[PDB]
Amino acid sequence: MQIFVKTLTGKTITLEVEPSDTIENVKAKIQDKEGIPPDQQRLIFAGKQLEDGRTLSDYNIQKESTLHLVLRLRGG
């Protein structure tokens, strides 16, 4: 299924995922496309933080959903 991933900066990354995908699995896809390590990636949905050790079925993520990927920079 298709999804939309808008970063905190306002970037809109288009990716593909399955209803049986995991948070970590998505992070890898994003990492491949962009390059940002999964450890620096954070998945927020409607303000709710999607924990890495969770599935898309936990927060009931549907298709054509808009996920917000926050980039926690360790630098300054």
Add this chain to the structure above:
Amino acid sequence: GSPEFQNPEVRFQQQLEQLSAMGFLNREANLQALIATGGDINAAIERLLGSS
């Protein structure tokens, strides 16, 4: 007029417009995060989603 931004009824009004536009159901906590940063919305949300 001249309202208080500290008041949870206002929630900065404009800053909350960006916070809600980035997908965030939180309101009060966001007002604090905005104060802690001083306008740095990105830095606020980063730490805000983690704790406070």
